[PDB]
């Protein structure tokens, strides 16, 4: 069945599309959802308790430099976190 | 906006069909694919590039998505400048 939370997400995209009147809805979609994805990625990396500050800033800067790698790179963060605890 | 409903509807349909683990990740994925489709379409509806010339820009878009507007300007500056 329909995933819980899809309606809120698509609603946010629609809201920003109406507020900003982008010339390309597809490009604005890629932009919007890439920004949203990196936002939650920063959220995960910044909330993992067992990482330290050099690791935290290293993953955040690493996400800045190479964004597409995010889900690949944040997976590393989880596997670097499960270590210490 | 013209085309919003078809866009959101296609995304939702594919979300049900594929059940991705992350809706945001799948959004980036799906809409990047759509953007490349639109770019291929744009290149493909230029009247005064010719056929073999037309394929070359598509190959440029096949490799990495990050320099599209240059190819739209170059094609737009090549065709409306090539013929009649």
Residue numbers in the entry:
A (entry chain B): 2 to 86
B (entry chain A): 4 to 87
Pull verbatim passages from the article behind this deposition.
Here, we propose a method for generating proteins and protein complexes with complicated shapes using fusions of alpha helices. To design amino acid sequences that can stabilize the alpha helical structure of the fusion sites, we superimposed one or two turns of terminal alpha helices of connecting proteins using a molecular graphics program. Then, the amino acid residues important for forming a fused helical structure were chosen from the two natural sequences in the superimposed region. Our method does not require complicated computer calculations for the design process and can be used for the assembly of artificial protein complexes with predictable and rigid structures.
The third example we chose was a fusion between the protein kinase A regulatory motif (PKA_RIIα) and the protein A module. For the helix design, 6 amino acids of the PKA module were superimposed with the N-terminal helix of protein A. As expected, protein A was connected to the PKA module by a continuous fused helix in the crystal structure. Because the PKA module forms a stable dimer, this method can be used to generate forced homodimeric proteins that may be useful in designing artificial protein nanostructures. (b) Crystal structure of the PKA_RIIα (dimerization domain of the regulatory subunit of protein kinase A)–protein A fusion protein. In comparison, the fusion proteins PKA_RIIα-protein A, MrsD-protein A and DARPin-protein A ligated by the shared helix method have negligible structural flexibility at the fusion sites.
